[PDB]
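In the laboratory, one determines a bound structure by crystallizing the protein with its ligand and collecting diffraction data. In a computational setting the workflow is compressed into a single prediction: the sequence and the ligand go in, and a structural description comes out. We illustrate the idea with chloride ion.
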Amino acid sequence: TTRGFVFTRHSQTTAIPSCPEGTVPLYSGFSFLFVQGNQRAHGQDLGTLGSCLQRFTTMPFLFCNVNDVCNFASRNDYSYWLSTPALMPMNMAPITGRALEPYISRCTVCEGPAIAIAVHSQTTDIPPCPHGWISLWKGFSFIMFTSAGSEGTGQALASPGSCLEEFRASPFLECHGRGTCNYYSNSYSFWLASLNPERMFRKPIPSTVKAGELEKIISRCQVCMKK
Amino acid sequence: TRGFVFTRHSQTTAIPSCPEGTVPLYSGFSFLFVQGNQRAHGQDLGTLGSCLQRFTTMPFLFCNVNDVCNFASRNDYSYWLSTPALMPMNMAPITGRALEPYISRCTVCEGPAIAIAVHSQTTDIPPCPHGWISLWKGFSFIMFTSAGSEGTGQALASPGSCLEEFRASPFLECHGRGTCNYYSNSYSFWLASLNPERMFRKPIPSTVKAGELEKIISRCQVCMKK
Amino acid sequence: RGFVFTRHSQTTAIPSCPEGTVPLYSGFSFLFVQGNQRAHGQDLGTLGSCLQRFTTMPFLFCNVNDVCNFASRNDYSYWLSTPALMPMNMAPITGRALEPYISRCTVCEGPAIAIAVHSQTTDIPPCPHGWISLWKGFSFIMFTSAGSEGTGQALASPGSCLEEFRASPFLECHGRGTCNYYSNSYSFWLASLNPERMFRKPIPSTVKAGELEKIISRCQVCMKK
Amino acid sequence: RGFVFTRHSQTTAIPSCPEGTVPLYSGFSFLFVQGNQRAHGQDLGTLGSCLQRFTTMPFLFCNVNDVCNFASRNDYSYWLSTPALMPMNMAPITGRALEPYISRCTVCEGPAIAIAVHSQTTDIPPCPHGWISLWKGFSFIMFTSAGSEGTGQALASPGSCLEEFRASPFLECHGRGTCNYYSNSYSFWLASLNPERMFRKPIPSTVKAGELEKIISRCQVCMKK
Amino acid sequence: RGFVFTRHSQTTAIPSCPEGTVPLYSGFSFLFVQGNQRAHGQDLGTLGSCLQRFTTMPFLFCNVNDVCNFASRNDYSYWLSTPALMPMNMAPITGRALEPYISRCTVCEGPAIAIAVHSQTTDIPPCPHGWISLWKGFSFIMFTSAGSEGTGQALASPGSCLEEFRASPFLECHGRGTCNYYSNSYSFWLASLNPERMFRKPIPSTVKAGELEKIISRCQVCMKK
Amino acid sequence: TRGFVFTRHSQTTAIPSCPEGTVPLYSGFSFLFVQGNQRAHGQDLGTLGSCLQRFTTMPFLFCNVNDVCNFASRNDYSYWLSTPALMPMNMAPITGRALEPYISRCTVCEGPAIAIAVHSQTTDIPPCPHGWISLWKGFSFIMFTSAGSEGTGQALASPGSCLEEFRASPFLECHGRGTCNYYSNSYSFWLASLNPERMFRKPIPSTVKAGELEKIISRCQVCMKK
Ligand SMILES: [Cl-]
Ligand SMILES: [Cl-]
Ligand SMILES: [Cl-]
Ligand SMILES: [Cl-]
Ligand SMILES: [Cl-]
Ligand SMILES: [Cl-]
Ligand SMILES: [Cl-]
Ligand SMILES: [Cl-]
Ligand SMILES: [Cl-]
Ligand SMILES: [Cl-]
Ligand SMILES: [Cl-]
Ligand SMILES: [Cl-]
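The predicted complex, in structure-token form:
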């Protein structure tokens, strides 16, 4: 029998992901990272049911004022979703309508018998689950993100959401009330850094790496469940 | 009972009741967020943190590196969920005792299992997952902004993202100088009700007024495992 | 049973897990980071606030050109500090001289959920019936530093209940390797209130060293028995 | 002699240059833009506040990959408005229906520099000795809209002295082509003060339609003769 | 001829207009305001930086419901200060007790444009060929206070050249009527550089009371002769 | 001359020439804006303030209420107009002296009358008004953002809003730690070229790449009164 501890897994592809062994699916949906309303970012924990919306839309929210008037998609607000590996058109222009379907990551909301946590190494090595815990999946340490106006937020390192299984320099898409989505130059992803186990307490060594050797410098992580 | 604490908010002057199967720990006033040095920080409305037993327009102070602290001695803010009580004709701020009819009430409860929230994104109430029990039905409350457009939101997994009465203006702005008021830039953000067939379609801009607002709001339930 | 929380020493000493709980690992007290001038914090009552490796730059960023940078711009990190004071030149510190300054933490596992309770008065609040006291502390709500960026703690969380009150509970650290206290470094605490005066206009108060804990709300971290 | 300034009608009528000055051109009243959520304004008393062609998106941005985007993200523009009121439905407007809403301006050239003088009282301030009055108005100091971004006018500039007081002197316009008034659109004005009451605590005051101009500071725009 | 500028005493004394210029009025040194958490400043070398009447709340705001509020929310105003020290209790001040802390200013009229010149060294820069010196000072570039909001001065403007260097050149004032210095109140100045190696890594430097002026860039305000 | 000072920017390592009729006062390096304590403050590119004689990555310092000043001892920024010099393939920041080939140069000039800017909002060059003389042609440069998306802009009335050489990346980000680089979030804002035949209709979204950029940029002239 289950116990009431709900968490989420994200495919980061168009494929609906599988719940790890021992856990049961509740429902599936699309990977919902954060919104920007009136230029204020608010995010969802990627390891909770909040990060998995049944319905996709570029505008999942509305706002209301003190005159008792509400507006939906009637101003310049934002929403952000985890993306697939799918490429953007050569023209570099935004996309609208059903052409977005290949771009949005999918998620499964799962229920387990115990709490699921995440563990981080800060090194290239996979961290071990604590004693008495079971491994659910391997991943990379995903800490925070900024996009337009450099607004954004992050994930709790204790949460399964801080451990993405596919590393991507661009893990998310910027979407608008007017119906468009795109990657933009100021879209940033922040990750915990892989560090030298010998070099503690010294000036960090500035480092700039390019495609092909990026995972070389990313902290690793595991999501674990109590037995 | 097993240690899973959550909160219910009346959104009226009435102290709310804990749902069947849960036990009250204490009661207090509905505490949404603060603004210190122009930085918003909020509390999860489904956790004990959103229920303070002692109301005040200034529940906090700040301290510097010269070991000097100040209470209510600068322009900082606090925010509380409000009642349906309307504001005086003059549109001026209120101070002192006259605030009592405006502050929402809360009860901190204890249950045998975790309480989560489920959202539909449609006008229909979502079902609790298999093996879960309904605690209350409500509306999907996601974020909020006020002065300097600062603010934060609720976790959609949390009971706090599911308010039982919908209000265009669910909160009051309060100041260290002792005053509170609704302001033009006070905004509430809610998950939108969507048409089931039109997924991956350009959203249709919509502007609705009093009397037909609840109509475009996403619905939710708070559920506890059995 | 699976309920993980963290304790913070606020000294160079590695803290002890409370009665009935087992240590998972120890590390350094990690409060928050500032990337591209956006603050993001960790809950001080969860394993996230306790990193095994200390560094002034625990993170990196990557762009849409598939290029990543580590400590190659002006980003920040923040850690809870010890009572160690700063060199009188008032200049920043680098390298291994930082060790006496960084607070320490132990990640613990318990049989049940640990919550925090707050009084809003100088009196210690009682644990709800059926709950056990883990430690008593002060109500820590939020914090700002550079650009007045920052975040806070959940009052429900063990993290909102620091055992040692300090006007300056954290250090500002930089990618270039330096750390220091700065004038705009602020700590926010729940205020101690007079019980017989609710719904009355707050009385502005300014207190100095020796007098500070007099106006701080008190708290307890409790676990279900 | 080369001293250029601007006058704003705040109506659909193209304004007249004051006596002794010559028109250079006319256009639409351009207040400020918001790109990537950063406000930048134009001085309302300089030719920059008068754009020949109106559009809801007068600008574009370019990145380091040598790619530029026009009206392809969520950016803003702001224009001084007319007294024309908005539709029943409270929805935004697009297209040609915007005409009746955008204020007109004329760029003028004078023989001397034009300045503004402010009273901080209900009384019109006198031009300094040897200066000539160009127009009367109200002391307009700053403004905020979405994200509470915005900027203001220099009080030394003609731009800080609007001839027609309006609670809502400007319209918020978008790259998607729409414009509207919004609840968080604010206008800031220098306040009319009691002459006896200096270094006294300010008296909080809230006024409604019909009594608003009682509390606004007055101003004159003057040119050297 | 119509070229208006301002001089600031930075004391309780009403300053004198420089040789060849005429006083038009005097007042109090007005730096910037914060409405709805947005800073907007005045150029310290223009008449806007010199307000006839002092108050902690020189402005009001109005919404789209045609409702205006004066001193009825948490807004700010900022003024240049005197060398007057603050009471030992470190608490804010209200009322007429503020009189000894607000700097004074004189608005002057000259025959030609007044500009500022900066050295980036400890040496006083020379006026360009055909220009006359009005005063000597220090290079004042920007400032931040609450929420780290603020703005600065144009280096071309007389306002970027303060005659008296002060680590704390301004006071923070509130709608509720109080003013004080705060820990996060910051002044930014152009730095004095040693002429030999340009394009070389800046040397981090931290100095305290008694030598501060050794590292500040110098400036002169000049008028065309 | 009569006392009207303005600046010209080469946008190259070459010290620019004052336009005919004007006299040089001095020269220096093209200084755009700074970021202290995460607040941007800029200089007008058409005034002497945009031209500093001594380049440095940290032209400023800050002081607190304890009478303590710090120079280059925190994370602050400075921004300068750049040259067409490209960056090393490693994409890493530069320090010290590999820096000179990157900083734009400027000349501060004195004229007999006021120098203004005129903008077309079309691909055509705008004519100087009646009785005014052309100093140079250029492109309409309105604002800029970089780190934290902080930034400011130029006055369209000012010579500074009219850059002679269009660049997607007109400026470099420099730091107190001594480094400089282009970054992804470095943005330049320009007035757009518009279809004359349309006014008051939807803007047509447009995305344009290298080779076709100046096609959509508004044009400008800097003029002086005769
Ligand atoms: Cl929208
Ligand atoms: Cl882009
Ligand atoms: Cl306060
Ligand atoms: Cl209001
Ligand atoms: Cl960094
Ligand atoms: Cl400092
Ligand atoms: Cl746009
Ligand atoms: Cl609205
Ligand atoms: Cl106020
Ligand atoms: Cl302070
Ligand atoms: Cl620095
Ligand atoms: Cl970058």
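The radius of gyration of chain F is 18 Å. Keep in mind that any predicted model is a hypothesis to be tested, not a measurement.
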